Amino acid sequence: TENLYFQSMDLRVQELIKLICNVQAMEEMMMEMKYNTKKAPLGKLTVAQIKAGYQSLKKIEDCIRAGQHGRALMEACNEFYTRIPHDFGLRTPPLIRTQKELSEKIQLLEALGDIEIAIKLVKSPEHPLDQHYRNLHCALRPLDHESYEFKVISQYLQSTHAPTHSDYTMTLLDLFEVEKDGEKEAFREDLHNRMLLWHGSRMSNWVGILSHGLRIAHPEAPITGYMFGKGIYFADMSSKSANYCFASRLKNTGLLLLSEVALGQCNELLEANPKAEGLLQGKHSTKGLGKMAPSSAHFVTLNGSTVPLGPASDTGILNPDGYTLNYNEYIVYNPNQVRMRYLLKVQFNF
Numbered sequence: 283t284e285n286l287y288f289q290s291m292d293l294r295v296q297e298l299i300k301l302i303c304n305v306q307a308m309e310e311m312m313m314e315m316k317y318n319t320k321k322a323p324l325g326k327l328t329v330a331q332i333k334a335g336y337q338s339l340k341k342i343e344d345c346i347r348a349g350q351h352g353r354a355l356m357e358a359c360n361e362f363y364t365r366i367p368h369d370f371g372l373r374t375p376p377l378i379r380t381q382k383e384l385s386e387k388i389q390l391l392e393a394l395g396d397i398e399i400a401i402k403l404v405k406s407p408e409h410p411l412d413q414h415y416r417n418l419h420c421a422l423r424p425l426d427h428e429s430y431e432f433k434v435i436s437q438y439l440q441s442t443h444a445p446t447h448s449d450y451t452m453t454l455l456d457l458f459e460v461e462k463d464g465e466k467e468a469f470r471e472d473l474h475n476r477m478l479l480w481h482g483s484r485m486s487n488w489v490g491i492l493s494h495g496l497r498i499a500h501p502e503a504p505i506t507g508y509m510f511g512k513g514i515y516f517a518d519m520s521s522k523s524a525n526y527c528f529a530s531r532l533k534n535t536g537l538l539l540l541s542e543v544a545l546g547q548c549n550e551l552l553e554a555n556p557k558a559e560g561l562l563q564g565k566h567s568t569k570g571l572g573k574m575a576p577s578s579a580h581f582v583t584l585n586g587s588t589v590p591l592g593p594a595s596d597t598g599i600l601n602p603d604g605y606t607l608n609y610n611e612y613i614v615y616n617p618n619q620v621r622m623r624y625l626l627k628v629q630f631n632f
């Protein structure tokens with residue numbers, strides 16, 4: 283009954299904060315991604331250096347697009363590796379020549395960007411954990427495991443776990459309601475087709491996401507890193523987003539975010555187009571159409587947002603040209619179409 287006297291941060295919030303603010307975990311995560319933390323300590327990384335990294339990736343993009351492989355491309359990849367040091371040990375540093383390889387470097391810089399944010403943020407009479415939490419300017423309130431909200435979100439979590447993501451299952455360890463300063467008032471409440479949708483991210487990135495909100499891509503990032511342009515990406519299948527947690531048997535605790543997304547009218551597309559944003563022409567979002575999705579007969583709503591409970595079934599969508607997405611994804615291009623609402627602490631069972 284100590285809390286009636288002294289009013290502490292709930293233990294579950296303390297443990298969350300300890301988890302996402304762990305700078306050692308960030309160092310290990312970047313070393314796994316082949317970033318050379320010894321040559322370029324994360325503490326000294328600046329926004330300008332990351333920006334310069336993106337500009338080198340753009341030079342690489344120019345080269346890939348022109349089919350170049352000689353001097354221009356070598357010069358570009360060397361420049362990139364000079365600006366964003368990597369550790370390939372004794373192995374030839376690899377060329378960056380495909381969309382997937384470009385995207386991986388982009389995700390490395392996205393992580394570096396959120397790390398730069400976190401290290402600044404975690405720098406009195408106040409306990410370090412109270413200080414970190416305050417500095418997020420984002421309320422996080424644990425929810426009761428016997429609440430209605432917990433039940434619906436566990437159902438959404440399990441029932442939208444996709445059949446082709448069978449290398450793990452997920453256990454919901456804890457649940458927090460998220461109220462980020464400003465989002466309620468900015469949100470596009472007027473738009474129809476408001477859905478509660480998934481976003482996953484690496485564990486290094488949550489200090490940045492909670493303190494700044496979900497953001498569109500850096501303006502200097504190569505556009506070809508982004509399947510449907512520089513928007514904020516969401517899934518209706520929990521495991522499509524959870525894959526982007528990059529959890530593993532070694533590090534099997536990750537987080538998953540649910541947000542209210544004001545989709546309005548969707549421009550529906552069957553295959554990648556990085557210039558998708560320019561195709562909106564008055565519509566409000568992009569939907570990449572998948573072969574399998576939850577169907578409306580099973581939907582429920584939670585506080586005005588449609589919750590697309592599974593199981594997934596065939597959508598009857600095939601592309602007669604080539605590749606079709608396995609599952610849907612949704613893209614909005616203004617943060618005011620996003621209101622963060624829940625954060626799940628997830629145990630991944632490999």
Ligand SMILES: C[C@]1(c2nc3cccc(C(N)=O)c3[nH]2)CCCN1
Nearest residue numbers: 480481482483515516517523526611
């Ligand atoms: C490749 C990329 C990405 N695509 C997604 C599609 C559905 C969900 C997510 C998510 N993170 O939950 C996605 N993330 C592009 C933007 C950042 N990473």
